[PDB]
Design a protein around this ligand. Structure first.
Ligand code: NA
Ligand code: NA
Lengths: 519, 104, 104, 519
């Protein structure tokens, strides 16, 4: 381990071995000094115009962190295509992480003149929250992950966290965490860091779409032996009185047939069209938003439980806050136009999951008698019911991979709503920080903590290797399947490539459900 | 032991084992040149307004020194709470000290 | 086992061993004759003012029963404090029950 | 272990073996039901006429306890005489305790007619506070110890204790103890109990008087080589001016001689004569009492540090609260007459310890000059000084044996002031209680704790055997020693024997210091 010796090589590749695929990606990173080496209490109350739904109390820290919770951090577009076009499923098995070729640079600023040089003896500090003692900030769809394109140099995100709050104030249970309290490895140029991790057992992601629907599992050609109430009143003319008539469900009465299952849970969202002219002329994104109520404040149930984005022929419709939406390259942070973002679609699950913008179904609302007509009620919120079956939200090339399951007494189907794998012991948080280097101190002793430091930052490479287990497709479907494919005809540029300006871009969201499977 | 190699890691932690608790803390320090590298006779007599109760004779040296004779140098607030809320007593047994990642 | 010999001692205590705590409590009890040694059908219908939400049918028996389904049956206030101030969790593992020094 | 079988024999004896003496005594006891089987908060504040110096907060318990912390519980008068007339010292080594021949009786009360019968199936509970977790109530000179006379049946004392208080109220640190929280042995008639204990290493008690005094250790016949300032002014007539004259201490100037030691510490007490006519005519027992000030309240330093009761020829004088005082048989509890009590005397220690009613000595009080005569100050309170030597208070046949040293960070010469051996781990407290036996309960369930119990009490024997180590006398004194002796001439009764009424009595206090020893 010396100044003149590399401490690691560039490992970027993918190998397919059978029921496994191993991805490996390396990137060059840059880490500045955050918070001026300080920890700062940050808060936001209800003063000014800040609403109560957005209050918070927490801290910003001088630390940065590595994040690769995004599929494109590991799969190239072509690899993603190889995965989704041929496998009914897949899942993470184990990973290796490495930090190397570290270099700490210090910048001198005198008379407009700026010079940067190495500080051969400075160190960075690194450690993993292997015992999950820090607030788990990963799994919240934050920016700062390794770039999709291998040639892009990225900046390391700053670590910050939240605790309990009451307005802009802290409460008795509010917790303060000092990351310097943890043992951490100190590396100088020449030193490297690495660790291994094994994923817990988790189900394969459903990278397939159903080629059958819950309400169409019977034999088209045979009647049931079971009967259903088919008539409640006579029909012979005008002397119509009450009676009781029963019939057997059959090919023409599939909606009446007795069935064994029920569609998945529902939490109805407001519908909105991509054809603005068809929408009400008001600003309802928030006022008509589907939300949950937690201790006084409201949050969008975004994207909320997995529901079909729209029913047959209505591609223009989508749940106001019930789908993942990515931005196109350079889309504005605020009020970006529809043509600057990319809406995803969980259309593939219409097959088992209720459509996100409609009722779950209908229930009786009273007791009918001869003097009281029967009444019905529309169900727009339907929790788990015995016999329900459903699918989870799909995952995307540019979407999240996993999330830490909250440590609670209970929960229900812990599949992270934004999509992905829910893990009790997810990949550990990897914290990194440039060690503060005092600028000359006074010549006579003083109690005060130093606050004058040499200006510096660090850079180096990072590698992440993940082994994935594949669940091969075993279909007897005779006719060809749907497959993700590149466009055929000429185009100004190549999809999933760089610009004349060297800018890489992801033209569209790529899901995972192309192959089909029976129910 | 080289220019490009760290000579120690950051050890800051606490472990409770039964009738023992081990504290470990690391800090970053800075040391200036003191007394211009000199030893100086320093004194204070009874002239001016200086009272006799405060007279003294000694020396200032070009040296610095490490001091961790203060409980919070070892126990975090929470650890101190764990200690005082559950034990009738405690006492120091042994220690390890280390200086590393030195840069002039 | 004789008239003049105790058939058990008073065990009331608590011991903390690490990831375990063993509670032990003894009490003196009294048992009368219930229901005049009889089993009786007991019922409550919707007559008088008794609402339907409270109707019931069952039996009262000549038997008594032991119950210690209440944490204070095992933890003293101080022990409860030792438990809740230092542990993220706890749970029951096994138990021993004993009846002795019986006198009719 | 049966109803018809004794569970122990009567062991009362003494055997002398050399440097050891083993005492053994058995007594018959009776234990009633205390506090109606209840624990009760007891308090005493500053209301009515109750002074602040006497406030307190604590609890009375349903338990009784065994106490044998009194030498006459083990030594007969003759044995005590054998001990003190022949040994320079002695100390406790180990003990055995036993409870047996237990019988629980229940009393029926109907129409003035009272009958008592056995309750063959009832139990008593016994246990030792072997880990010193309960307030140590022994060592406070309380009544209730085994009787001096073997034939006397005694009643077991009730256990109660005190915690912190503020007036008649408790405070945050006040502790409540439940003795049923402790494991305890349950015995029916037929069962027995016993335990063993070993005394910690402790110095031999000084059962001797010094035949030399601190200020008379030199050779009567030789001068010192050392000099002392003997003259400060000339003497030749009236032209007397200052000068400096020095001399050598010698046989006629022993008070001036240089010496190596200093008399023991001092805490001056007010003197009082047994000839009432010589005392001031006022009620000064409390107002002139020697006391210590602890958190707002005052206590008599009684008897306080060990000091000689009186100097030569003043047997009639004694410290108002600086000596142990026992009562004669049947002396009233309150305002007993002088002729009804027995004052002890620590006269034997005049030899090293200051007299309790005089100064420790004299010190300079200023800086003398030619224009300022020297001044002196009388010292009435003198704490430990390098070079001091002293003796402890003597112990008495009817006095206490040991006391538990308070659990504190520090202390000084932990010899219990009332006299005896100070132990960090003294004999454990032995608690005993009759188990409550419900009288018939109601026939239909009720939440309330039972409060109706069968009336009963218990009785049985108790044995205590203690082994004492003796320090034999090794004197070369030619002439006979002083010895405790029975009176020679006729008397109405025999000292240390019973009455025509069968009442045993101890005519006088018997100390321990008869043999002599050089310094
Ligand atoms: Na493409
Ligand atoms: Na006598």
């Amino acid at each position: 381990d010396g100044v003149g010796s590399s401490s690691g090589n560039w490992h970027c590749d993918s190998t397919w071995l059978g029921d496994r695929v191993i991805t490996t990606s390396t990137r060059t990173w840059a880490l500045p000094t955050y918070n001026n080496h300080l920890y700062k209490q940050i808060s936001n109350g209800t003063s000014g115009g800040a609403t109560n739904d957005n209050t918070y109390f927490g801290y910003s820290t001088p630390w940065g962190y590595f994040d690769f919770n995004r599929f494109h951090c590991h799969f190239s577009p072509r690899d993603w295509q190889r995965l989704i076009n041929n496998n009914w499923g897949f899942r993470p098995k184990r990973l290796s992480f490495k930090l190397f070729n570290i270099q700490v640079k210090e910048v001198t600023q005198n008379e407009g003149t700026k010079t940067i040089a190495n500080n051969l003896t400075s160190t960075i500090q690194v450690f993993t929250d292997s015992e999950y003692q820090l607030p788990y900030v990963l799994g919240s769809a934050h920016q700062g992950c390794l770039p999709p394109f291998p040639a892009d140099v990225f900046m390391i995100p700053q670590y910050g966290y939240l605790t309990l709050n009451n307005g802009s104030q802290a409460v008795g249970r509010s917790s303060f965490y000092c990351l310097e309290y943890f043992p951490s490895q100190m590396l100088r140029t020449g030193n490297n860091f690495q660790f291994t991790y094994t994923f817990e057992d988790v189900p394969f992601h459903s990278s397939y779409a159903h080629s059958q629907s819950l309400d169409r599992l019977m034999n088209p050609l045979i009647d049931q032996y079971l009967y259903y109430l088919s008539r409640t009143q006579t029909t012979g003319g005008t002397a119509n009185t009450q009676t009781l008539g029963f019939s057997q469900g059959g090919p023409n009465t599939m909606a009446n047939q007795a069935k064994n299952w029920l569609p998945g849970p529902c939490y109805r969202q407001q519908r909105v069209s991509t054809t603005t002219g068809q929408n009400n002329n008001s600003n309802f994104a928030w006022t008509a938003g589907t939300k949950y109520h937690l201790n006084g404040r409201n949050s969008l149930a975004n994207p909320g439980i997995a529901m079909a984005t729209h029913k047959d022929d209505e591609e223009r419709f989508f749940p106001s806050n019930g789908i993942l939406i990515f931005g196109k390259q350079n889309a504005a942070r605020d009020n970006a136009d529809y043509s600057d973002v990319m809406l995803t679609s969980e259309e593939e699950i219409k097959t088992t999951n209720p459509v996100a913008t409609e009722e779950y179904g209908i229930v009786a609302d009273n007791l009918q008698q001869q003097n009281t007509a029967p009444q019905i009620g529309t169900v727009n919120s339907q929790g788990a019911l015995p016999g329900m079956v459903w699918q989870n939200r799909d995952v995307y090339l540019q979407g999240p991979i996993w999330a830490k399951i909250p440590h609670t007494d209970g929960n229900f189907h812990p599949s992270p709503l934004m999509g992905g794998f829910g893990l009790k012991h997810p990949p550990p948080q990897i914290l990194i920080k440039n060690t503060p280097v005092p600028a000359d101190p006074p010549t006579t002793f003083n109690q005060s903590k130093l606050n004058s430091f040499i200006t510096q930052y660090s850079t180096g490479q990072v590698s992440v290797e993940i082994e994935w287990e594949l669940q091969k497709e075993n279909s007897k479907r005779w006719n060809p399947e749907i497959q993700y494919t590149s466009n055929y005809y000429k185009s100004t540029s190549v999809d999933f490539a760089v610009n004349t300006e060297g800018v890489y871009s992801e033209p569209r969201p790529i899901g995972t459900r192309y192959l089909t499977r029976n129910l």
